[PDB]
PDB file of C-alpha atoms and ligand atoms in Angstrom:
ATOM      1  CA  UNK B   1      -8.876   5.631 -18.080  1.00  0.00           C
ATOM      2  CA  UNK B   2      -8.600   5.752 -14.290  1.00  0.00           C
ATOM      3  CA  UNK B   3      -7.013   9.079 -13.230  1.00  0.00           C
ATOM      4  CA  UNK B   4      -4.369   8.576 -10.469  1.00  0.00           C
ATOM      5  CA  UNK B   5      -3.321  11.050  -7.738  1.00  0.00           C
ATOM      6  CA  UNK B   6       0.358  10.429  -7.110  1.00  0.00           C
ATOM      7  CA  UNK B   7       3.287  12.223  -5.564  1.00  0.00           C
ATOM      8  CA  UNK B   8       6.954  12.095  -6.702  1.00  0.00           C
ATOM      9  CA  UNK B   9       9.293  10.881  -3.999  1.00  0.00           C
ATOM     10  CA  UNK B  10      12.856  11.915  -4.476  1.00  0.00           C
ATOM     11  CA  UNK B  11      15.461   9.309  -3.856  1.00  0.00           C
ATOM     12  CA  UNK B  12      18.714   9.251  -1.946  1.00  0.00           C
ATOM     13  CA  UNK B  13      20.098   7.691   1.217  1.00  0.00           C
ATOM     14  CA  UNK B  14      17.744   6.998   4.159  1.00  0.00           C
ATOM     15  CA  UNK B  15      17.352   5.328   7.535  1.00  0.00           C
ATOM     16  CA  UNK B  16      14.804   2.542   7.714  1.00  0.00           C
ATOM     17  CA  UNK B  17      14.203   0.737  11.042  1.00  0.00           C
ATOM     18  CA  UNK B  18      12.688   0.954  14.516  1.00  0.00           C
ATOM     19  CA  UNK B  19      14.297   4.147  15.847  1.00  0.00           C
ATOM     20  CA  UNK B  20      12.132   7.220  16.231  1.00  0.00           C
ATOM     21  CA  UNK B  21      12.508  10.651  17.825  1.00  0.00           C
ATOM     22  CA  UNK B  22      14.930  13.467  17.172  1.00  0.00           C
ATOM     23  CA  UNK B  23      18.067  11.819  15.900  1.00  0.00           C
ATOM     24  CA  UNK B  24      20.652  12.481  13.236  1.00  0.00           C
ATOM     25  CA  UNK B  25      19.122  10.095  10.685  1.00  0.00           C
ATOM     26  CA  UNK B  26      21.366  11.325   7.871  1.00  0.00           C
ATOM     27  CA  UNK B  27      24.350   9.955   9.830  1.00  0.00           C
ATOM     28  CA  UNK B  28      22.731   6.499  10.025  1.00  0.00           C
ATOM     29  CA  UNK B  29      21.224   6.022   6.602  1.00  0.00           C
ATOM     30  CA  UNK B  30      21.142   2.329   5.691  1.00  0.00           C
ATOM     31  CA  UNK B  31      19.132   1.977   2.450  1.00  0.00           C
ATOM     32  CA  UNK B  32      19.401   3.620  -0.957  1.00  0.00           C
ATOM     33  CA  UNK B  33      16.382   4.482  -3.014  1.00  0.00           C
ATOM     34  CA  UNK B  34      15.899   5.716  -6.558  1.00  0.00           C
ATOM     35  CA  UNK B  35      13.077   8.181  -7.154  1.00  0.00           C
ATOM     36  CA  UNK B  36       9.563   6.811  -7.382  1.00  0.00           C
ATOM     37  CA  UNK B  37       6.008   7.993  -7.562  1.00  0.00           C
ATOM     38  CA  UNK B  38       3.510   6.928  -4.827  1.00  0.00           C
ATOM     39  CA  UNK B  39      -0.263   7.155  -4.670  1.00  0.00           C
ATOM     40  CA  UNK B  40      -1.315   9.983  -2.338  1.00  0.00           C
ATOM     41  CA  UNK B  41      -4.025   7.825  -0.808  1.00  0.00           C
ATOM     42  CA  UNK B  42      -4.998   4.200  -0.360  1.00  0.00           C
ATOM     43  CA  UNK B  43      -6.775   2.860  -3.481  1.00  0.00           C
ATOM     44  CA  UNK B  44     -10.482   3.547  -3.023  1.00  0.00           C
ATOM     45  CA  UNK B  45     -13.358   1.165  -3.591  1.00  0.00           C
ATOM     46  CA  UNK B  46     -14.702   3.469  -6.315  1.00  0.00           C
ATOM     47  CA  UNK B  47     -11.297   3.180  -8.114  1.00  0.00           C
ATOM     48  CA  UNK B  48     -11.148  -0.541  -7.533  1.00  0.00           C
ATOM     49  CA  UNK B  49     -14.709  -1.191  -8.812  1.00  0.00           C
ATOM     50  CA  UNK B  50     -14.023   0.903 -11.926  1.00  0.00           C
ATOM     51  CA  UNK B  51     -10.849  -0.924 -12.932  1.00  0.00           C
ATOM     52  CA  UNK B  52     -12.612  -4.227 -12.128  1.00  0.00           C
ATOM     53  CA  UNK B  53     -15.310  -3.400 -14.606  1.00  0.00           C
ATOM     54  CA  UNK B  54     -12.790  -2.277 -17.286  1.00  0.00           C
ATOM     55  CA  UNK B  55     -10.453  -5.254 -16.923  1.00  0.00           C
ATOM     56  CA  UNK B  56     -13.170  -7.988 -16.916  1.00  0.00           C
ATOM     57  CA  UNK B  57     -13.311  -8.004 -20.699  1.00  0.00           C
ATOM     58  CA  UNK B  58      -9.503  -7.785 -21.163  1.00  0.00           C
ATOM     59  CA  UNK B  59      -8.723 -10.998 -19.347  1.00  0.00           C
ATOM     60  CA  UNK B  60      -7.819  -9.630 -15.911  1.00  0.00           C
ATOM     61  CA  UNK B  61      -9.443 -11.202 -12.875  1.00  0.00           C
ATOM     62  CA  UNK B  62      -9.495  -8.602 -10.086  1.00  0.00           C
ATOM     63  CA  UNK B  63     -11.620 -10.096  -7.415  1.00  0.00           C
ATOM     64  CA  UNK B  64     -13.386  -9.136  -4.170  1.00  0.00           C
ATOM     65  CA  UNK B  65     -13.171  -5.539  -2.905  1.00  0.00           C
ATOM     66  CA  UNK B  66     -15.596  -3.719  -0.431  1.00  0.00           C
ATOM     67  CA  UNK B  67     -16.147  -0.090   0.356  1.00  0.00           C
ATOM     68  CA  UNK B  68     -14.062   0.301   3.517  1.00  0.00           C
ATOM     69  CA  UNK B  69     -15.290  -1.287   6.706  1.00  0.00           C
ATOM     70  CA  UNK B  70     -17.643  -0.887   9.653  1.00  0.00           C
ATOM     71  CA  UNK B  71     -16.494  -3.239  12.366  1.00  0.00           C
ATOM     72  CA  UNK B  72     -15.472  -6.263  10.320  1.00  0.00           C
ATOM     73  CA  UNK B  73     -18.169  -5.793   7.662  1.00  0.00           C
ATOM     74  CA  UNK B  74     -18.138  -3.700   4.406  1.00  0.00           C
ATOM     75  CA  UNK B  75     -19.924  -0.356   4.175  1.00  0.00           C
ATOM     76  CA  UNK B  76     -22.708  -0.137   1.541  1.00  0.00           C
ATOM     77  CA  UNK B  77     -20.945   0.307  -1.741  1.00  0.00           C
ATOM     78  CA  UNK B  78     -22.319   3.768  -2.229  1.00  0.00           C
ATOM     79  CA  UNK B  79     -21.271   5.251   1.098  1.00  0.00           C
ATOM     80  CA  UNK B  80     -19.248   8.423   0.855  1.00  0.00           C
ATOM     81  CA  UNK B  81     -19.202   7.930  -2.875  1.00  0.00           C
ATOM     82  CA  UNK B  82     -17.108   4.778  -2.593  1.00  0.00           C
ATOM     83  CA  UNK B  83     -14.215   6.940  -1.372  1.00  0.00           C
ATOM     84  CA  UNK B  84     -13.325   4.544   1.493  1.00  0.00           C
ATOM     85  CA  UNK B  85     -10.061   2.528   0.986  1.00  0.00           C
ATOM     86  CA  UNK B  86     -10.923  -0.706  -0.778  1.00  0.00           C
ATOM     87  CA  UNK B  87     -10.789  -3.673   1.605  1.00  0.00           C
ATOM     88  CA  UNK B  88     -11.074  -7.449   1.296  1.00  0.00           C
ATOM     89  CA  UNK B  89      -8.446  -7.562  -1.421  1.00  0.00           C
ATOM     90  CA  UNK B  90      -5.752 -10.174  -1.526  1.00  0.00           C
ATOM     91  CA  UNK B  91      -2.137  -9.594  -2.475  1.00  0.00           C
ATOM     92  CA  UNK B  92      -2.925 -11.289  -5.808  1.00  0.00           C
ATOM     93  CA  UNK B  93      -5.853  -8.897  -6.328  1.00  0.00           C
ATOM     94  CA  UNK B  94      -3.602  -5.957  -5.606  1.00  0.00           C
ATOM     95  CA  UNK B  95      -0.804  -6.928  -8.022  1.00  0.00           C
ATOM     96  CA  UNK B  96      -3.334  -7.858 -10.793  1.00  0.00           C
ATOM     97  CA  UNK B  97      -5.018  -4.518 -10.210  1.00  0.00           C
ATOM     98  CA  UNK B  98      -1.559  -2.988 -10.547  1.00  0.00           C
ATOM     99  CA  UNK B  99      -1.033  -4.718 -13.897  1.00  0.00           C
ATOM    100  CA  UNK B 100      -4.434  -3.679 -15.180  1.00  0.00           C
ATOM    101  CA  UNK B 101      -3.667  -0.049 -14.286  1.00  0.00           C
ATOM    102  CA  UNK B 102      -0.341  -0.340 -16.065  1.00  0.00           C
ATOM    103  CA  UNK B 103      -2.084  -1.589 -19.196  1.00  0.00           C
ATOM    104  CA  UNK B 104      -4.676   1.174 -18.931  1.00  0.00           C
ATOM    105  CA  UNK B 105      -1.915   3.725 -18.852  1.00  0.00           C
ATOM    106  CA  UNK B 106      -0.066   1.898 -21.600  1.00  0.00           C
ATOM    107  CA  UNK B 107       2.888   1.026 -19.176  1.00  0.00           C
ATOM    108  CA  UNK B 108       4.894  -2.228 -18.902  1.00  0.00           C
ATOM    109  CA  UNK B 109       3.748  -4.834 -16.337  1.00  0.00           C
ATOM    110  CA  UNK B 110       5.905  -5.401 -13.294  1.00  0.00           C
ATOM    111  CA  UNK B 111       4.337  -8.739 -12.287  1.00  0.00           C
ATOM    112  CA  UNK B 112       4.621 -11.477 -14.997  1.00  0.00           C
ATOM    113  CA  UNK B 113       4.092 -15.200 -15.321  1.00  0.00           C
ATOM    114  CA  UNK B 114       7.088 -17.440 -15.958  1.00  0.00           C
ATOM    115  CA  UNK B 115       6.504 -17.039 -19.692  1.00  0.00           C
ATOM    116  CA  UNK B 116       7.202 -13.243 -19.323  1.00  0.00           C
ATOM    117  CA  UNK B 117       3.870 -11.867 -19.813  1.00  0.00           C
ATOM    118  CA  UNK B 118       1.455  -9.958 -17.636  1.00  0.00           C
ATOM    119  CA  UNK B 119      -0.007 -11.689 -14.653  1.00  0.00           C
ATOM    120  CA  UNK B 120      -3.794 -11.484 -15.116  1.00  0.00           C
ATOM    121  CA  UNK B 121      -5.141 -14.382 -13.041  1.00  0.00           C
ATOM    122  CA  UNK B 122      -3.985 -15.678  -9.640  1.00  0.00           C
ATOM    123  CA  UNK B 123      -1.728 -18.732 -10.116  1.00  0.00           C
ATOM    124  CA  UNK B 124      -3.057 -22.127  -9.407  1.00  0.00           C
ATOM    125  CA  UNK B 125      -1.798 -23.767  -6.318  1.00  0.00           C
ATOM    126  CA  UNK B 126       1.864 -24.774  -6.793  1.00  0.00           C
ATOM    127  CA  UNK B 127       2.516 -22.640  -9.955  1.00  0.00           C
ATOM    128  CA  UNK B 128       2.852 -19.690  -7.583  1.00  0.00           C
ATOM    129  CA  UNK B 129       6.608 -19.967  -7.639  1.00  0.00           C
ATOM    130  CA  UNK B 130       7.178 -19.244 -11.292  1.00  0.00           C
ATOM    131  CA  UNK B 131       5.862 -15.688 -11.033  1.00  0.00           C
ATOM    132  CA  UNK B 132       8.574 -13.109 -11.781  1.00  0.00           C
ATOM    133  CA  UNK B 133       9.089  -9.414 -11.112  1.00  0.00           C
ATOM    134  CA  UNK B 134      10.475  -7.284 -13.919  1.00  0.00           C
ATOM    135  CA  UNK B 135      12.715  -4.628 -12.378  1.00  0.00           C
ATOM    136  CA  UNK B 136      12.981  -2.803 -15.750  1.00  0.00           C
ATOM    137  CA  UNK B 137       9.209  -2.419 -16.128  1.00  0.00           C
ATOM    138  CA  UNK B 138       7.742   1.102 -16.001  1.00  0.00           C
ATOM    139  CA  UNK B 139       4.352  -0.061 -14.548  1.00  0.00           C
ATOM    140  CA  UNK B 140       2.664   0.193 -11.190  1.00  0.00           C
ATOM    141  CA  UNK B 141       3.501  -2.219  -8.370  1.00  0.00           C
ATOM    142  CA  UNK B 142       3.338  -2.529  -4.590  1.00  0.00           C
ATOM    143  CA  UNK B 143       6.007  -0.610  -2.659  1.00  0.00           C
ATOM    144  CA  UNK B 144       8.994  -2.318  -1.133  1.00  0.00           C
ATOM    145  CA  UNK B 145       9.398  -2.084   2.686  1.00  0.00           C
ATOM    146  CA  UNK B 146      12.120   0.528   2.257  1.00  0.00           C
ATOM    147  CA  UNK B 147       9.967   2.601  -0.131  1.00  0.00           C
ATOM    148  CA  UNK B 148       6.903   2.424   2.046  1.00  0.00           C
ATOM    149  CA  UNK B 149       8.776   3.269   5.276  1.00  0.00           C
ATOM    150  CA  UNK B 150      10.701   6.117   3.723  1.00  0.00           C
ATOM    151  CA  UNK B 151       7.532   7.520   2.232  1.00  0.00           C
ATOM    152  CA  UNK B 152       5.705   7.207   5.592  1.00  0.00           C
ATOM    153  CA  UNK B 153       8.521   9.105   7.272  1.00  0.00           C
ATOM    154  CA  UNK B 154       8.326  11.939   4.669  1.00  0.00           C
ATOM    155  CA  UNK B 155      11.504  11.176   2.763  1.00  0.00           C
ATOM    156  CA  UNK B 156      13.802  14.090   2.139  1.00  0.00           C
ATOM    157  CA  UNK B 157      11.057  16.516   3.071  1.00  0.00           C
ATOM    158  CA  UNK B 158      10.705  14.932   6.444  1.00  0.00           C
ATOM    159  CA  UNK B 159      14.436  14.971   6.859  1.00  0.00           C
ATOM    160  CA  UNK B 160      14.449  18.664   5.958  1.00  0.00           C
ATOM    161  CA  UNK B 161      11.564  19.688   8.231  1.00  0.00           C
ATOM    162  CA  UNK B 162      12.457  17.488  11.158  1.00  0.00           C
ATOM    163  CA  UNK B 163       9.429  15.131  11.093  1.00  0.00           C
ATOM    164  CA  UNK B 164      11.348  12.097   9.828  1.00  0.00           C
ATOM    165  CA  UNK B 165      11.505  10.851  13.388  1.00  0.00           C
ATOM    166  CA  UNK B 166       7.703  11.043  13.899  1.00  0.00           C
ATOM    167  CA  UNK B 167       6.332   7.904  15.286  1.00  0.00           C
ATOM    168  CA  UNK B 168       3.264   8.149  13.071  1.00  0.00           C
ATOM    169  CA  UNK B 169       3.139   9.596   9.532  1.00  0.00           C
ATOM    170  CA  UNK B 170       3.518  13.340   9.808  1.00  0.00           C
ATOM    171  CA  UNK B 171       3.290  13.637  13.545  1.00  0.00           C
ATOM    172  CA  UNK B 172       4.476  11.981  16.724  1.00  0.00           C
ATOM    173  CA  UNK B 173       0.916  11.897  18.091  1.00  0.00           C
ATOM    174  CA  UNK B 174      -1.636   9.750  16.139  1.00  0.00           C
ATOM    175  CA  UNK B 175      -5.106  11.257  16.471  1.00  0.00           C
ATOM    176  CA  UNK B 176      -4.603  14.086  14.009  1.00  0.00           C
ATOM    177  CA  UNK B 177      -3.012  11.907  11.312  1.00  0.00           C
ATOM    178  CA  UNK B 178      -4.185   8.321  11.684  1.00  0.00           C
ATOM    179  CA  UNK B 179      -7.417   6.407  11.911  1.00  0.00           C
ATOM    180  CA  UNK B 180      -6.165   3.900  14.549  1.00  0.00           C
ATOM    181  CA  UNK B 181      -7.838   2.697  17.755  1.00  0.00           C
ATOM    182  CA  UNK B 182      -7.336   5.047  20.560  1.00  0.00           C
ATOM    183  CA  UNK B 183      -8.089   4.784  24.322  1.00  0.00           C
ATOM    184  CA  UNK B 184     -11.801   4.419  24.815  1.00  0.00           C
ATOM    185  CA  UNK B 185     -12.677   4.238  21.067  1.00  0.00           C
ATOM    186  CA  UNK B 186     -16.405   3.633  20.573  1.00  0.00           C
ATOM    187  CA  UNK B 187     -16.285   3.189  16.817  1.00  0.00           C
ATOM    188  CA  UNK B 188     -14.324   0.973  14.538  1.00  0.00           C
ATOM    189  CA  UNK B 189     -14.622   1.924  10.898  1.00  0.00           C
ATOM    190  CA  UNK B 190     -12.701   3.212   7.962  1.00  0.00           C
ATOM    191  CA  UNK B 191     -12.981   6.854   6.913  1.00  0.00           C
ATOM    192  CA  UNK B 192     -12.991   8.298   3.358  1.00  0.00           C
ATOM    193  CA  UNK B 193      -9.371   8.528   2.293  1.00  0.00           C
ATOM    194  CA  UNK B 194      -7.560  11.790   3.285  1.00  0.00           C
ATOM    195  CA  UNK B 195      -9.833  12.616   6.212  1.00  0.00           C
ATOM    196  CA  UNK B 196      -6.797  13.279   8.498  1.00  0.00           C
ATOM    197  CA  UNK B 197      -3.665  15.377   8.146  1.00  0.00           C
ATOM    198  CA  UNK B 198      -0.942  14.466   5.642  1.00  0.00           C
ATOM    199  CA  UNK B 199       2.770  13.873   6.142  1.00  0.00           C
ATOM    200  CA  UNK B 200       5.526  16.055   4.788  1.00  0.00           C
ATOM    201  CA  UNK B 201       5.263  14.422   1.337  1.00  0.00           C
ATOM    202  CA  UNK B 202       1.556  15.221   1.135  1.00  0.00           C
ATOM    203  CA  UNK B 203       0.556  11.565   1.639  1.00  0.00           C
ATOM    204  CA  UNK B 204      -2.633  10.559   3.559  1.00  0.00           C
ATOM    205  CA  UNK B 205      -3.343   7.586   5.785  1.00  0.00           C
ATOM    206  CA  UNK B 206       0.110   5.963   5.728  1.00  0.00           C
ATOM    207  CA  UNK B 207      -0.690   5.437   9.417  1.00  0.00           C
ATOM    208  CA  UNK B 208      -4.072   3.932  10.005  1.00  0.00           C
ATOM    209  CA  UNK B 209      -7.370   3.544   8.086  1.00  0.00           C
ATOM    210  CA  UNK B 210      -6.314   0.286   6.347  1.00  0.00           C
ATOM    211  CA  UNK B 211      -3.051  -1.512   6.663  1.00  0.00           C
ATOM    212  CA  UNK B 212      -1.198  -1.735   3.279  1.00  0.00           C
ATOM    213  CA  UNK B 213       0.179  -4.621   1.379  1.00  0.00           C
ATOM    214  CA  UNK B 214       3.838  -4.462   0.312  1.00  0.00           C
ATOM    215  CA  UNK B 215       5.891  -6.100  -2.410  1.00  0.00           C
ATOM    216  CA  UNK B 216       8.149  -7.299   0.323  1.00  0.00           C
ATOM    217  CA  UNK B 217       8.442 -11.106   0.627  1.00  0.00           C
ATOM    218  CA  UNK B 218       8.792 -12.857   3.997  1.00  0.00           C
ATOM    219  CA  UNK B 219      10.536 -16.219   3.414  1.00  0.00           C
ATOM    220  CA  UNK B 220       8.864 -19.356   4.887  1.00  0.00           C
ATOM    221  CA  UNK B 221       9.066 -23.092   4.636  1.00  0.00           C
ATOM    222  CA  UNK B 222       6.427 -24.919   2.632  1.00  0.00           C
ATOM    223  CA  UNK B 223       4.075 -24.411  -0.311  1.00  0.00           C
ATOM    224  CA  UNK B 224       3.034 -20.979   0.599  1.00  0.00           C
ATOM    225  CA  UNK B 225       4.612 -17.280   0.050  1.00  0.00           C
ATOM    226  CA  UNK B 226       4.017 -14.523   2.569  1.00  0.00           C
ATOM    227  CA  UNK B 227       4.109 -10.734   2.145  1.00  0.00           C
ATOM    228  CA  UNK B 228       4.322  -7.806   4.550  1.00  0.00           C
ATOM    229  CA  UNK B 229       1.609  -5.341   5.210  1.00  0.00           C
ATOM    230  CA  UNK B 230       2.246  -2.160   7.253  1.00  0.00           C
ATOM    231  CA  UNK B 231       1.001   0.921   8.911  1.00  0.00           C
ATOM    232  CA  UNK B 232      -1.932  -0.154  11.119  1.00  0.00           C
ATOM    233  CA  UNK B 233      -5.603   0.175  10.554  1.00  0.00           C
ATOM    234  CA  UNK B 234      -8.897   1.322  12.081  1.00  0.00           C
ATOM    235  CA  UNK B 235      -8.911  -1.974  14.114  1.00  0.00           C
ATOM    236  CA  UNK B 236      -5.175  -2.629  14.353  1.00  0.00           C
ATOM    237  CA  UNK B 237      -3.419  -0.468  16.916  1.00  0.00           C
ATOM    238  CA  UNK B 238       0.286  -0.159  16.147  1.00  0.00           C
ATOM    239  CA  UNK B 239       3.025   1.622  18.050  1.00  0.00           C
ATOM    240  CA  UNK B 240       4.560   3.329  15.090  1.00  0.00           C
ATOM    241  CA  UNK B 241       4.791   3.358  11.294  1.00  0.00           C
ATOM    242  CA  UNK B 242       7.507   0.622  11.593  1.00  0.00           C
ATOM    243  CA  UNK B 243       4.957  -2.033  12.708  1.00  0.00           C
ATOM    244  CA  UNK B 244       4.197  -4.602  10.035  1.00  0.00           C
ATOM    245  CA  UNK B 245       2.990  -8.125   9.951  1.00  0.00           C
ATOM    246  CA  UNK B 246       2.643 -10.810   7.215  1.00  0.00           C
ATOM    247  CA  UNK B 247       0.009 -12.937   5.433  1.00  0.00           C
ATOM    248  CA  UNK B 248      -0.085 -15.389   2.515  1.00  0.00           C
ATOM    249  CA  UNK B 249      -0.924 -13.703  -0.836  1.00  0.00           C
ATOM    250  CA  UNK B 250      -4.327 -15.316  -1.111  1.00  0.00           C
ATOM    251  CA  UNK B 251      -5.510 -13.807   2.205  1.00  0.00           C
ATOM    252  CA  UNK B 252      -7.823 -10.774   2.503  1.00  0.00           C
ATOM    253  CA  UNK B 253      -9.456  -8.972   5.369  1.00  0.00           C
ATOM    254  CA  UNK B 254     -11.657  -5.993   6.251  1.00  0.00           C
ATOM    255  CA  UNK B 255      -8.697  -3.865   7.334  1.00  0.00           C
ATOM    256  CA  UNK B 256      -6.041  -4.503   4.686  1.00  0.00           C
ATOM    257  CA  UNK B 257      -5.864  -2.489   1.470  1.00  0.00           C
ATOM    258  CA  UNK B 258      -3.058  -1.069  -0.634  1.00  0.00           C
ATOM    259  CA  UNK B 259      -1.529   1.773  -2.508  1.00  0.00           C
ATOM    260  CA  UNK B 260       0.805   1.632  -5.499  1.00  0.00           C
ATOM    261  CA  UNK B 261       4.110   2.969  -6.643  1.00  0.00           C
ATOM    262  CA  UNK B 262       5.848   3.331 -10.010  1.00  0.00           C
ATOM    263  CA  UNK B 263       9.502   4.124 -10.882  1.00  0.00           C
ATOM    264  CA  UNK B 264      10.459   7.498 -12.275  1.00  0.00           C
ATOM    265  CA  UNK B 265      13.125   7.138 -14.993  1.00  0.00           C
TER     266      UNK B 265
HETATM  267  K1  LIG Q   1      -3.247   3.193   5.683  1.00  0.00           K
END
């Protein structure tokens, strides 16, 4: 069993959007969340490799994965004990990983094929569209945009301590909290997770290190799906924690990883 470091995030009414700074966010809340648990860090390569090995014989195909990144390449798998965020994982890899972790912890899978069972293998081209999400499942999944944003902003704790309006997670200035390119940077690489300061929920690297896949769909014409990823990375300078972009679910890159959530009942 893979042991998971997660934090409970209390629910309630919250502001999600592009406004930052000292404002009365309580007066402008626009999304409702139920409580959920979130991983304190990005999933590490060491975690990813370990569940890969466990799930291979149980029918799950969790593919790719590198130990962080140095420029656009992977670090050697043993560097810093494999504690860099895993990179070069697709959205499919992430949600299959999520199902395998659910199984491991004897929880119900959130992502299922059209026949209602656990997604274990990425769908063949076309059959993509029959994949379902089970909102009653107790298992791990990718965060929604609202969940991820609220968590990045510190939730109720950030509201209480006045950091909810921080442009980056935990603090309005990025160097102390986020591995993101900065003026004159001479190095472009991931760091072991939780090398910088946390936000008010005790989460690490919501800003920077790797960008993070979300559950959130971005609707497009044609045969392909697209999903958000947020937060910036060691090579992707962003202006705030509200900056996201999108990719198809089969895509992977040296600066995109993930972290998971699960509902609390
Ligand atoms: K991150």
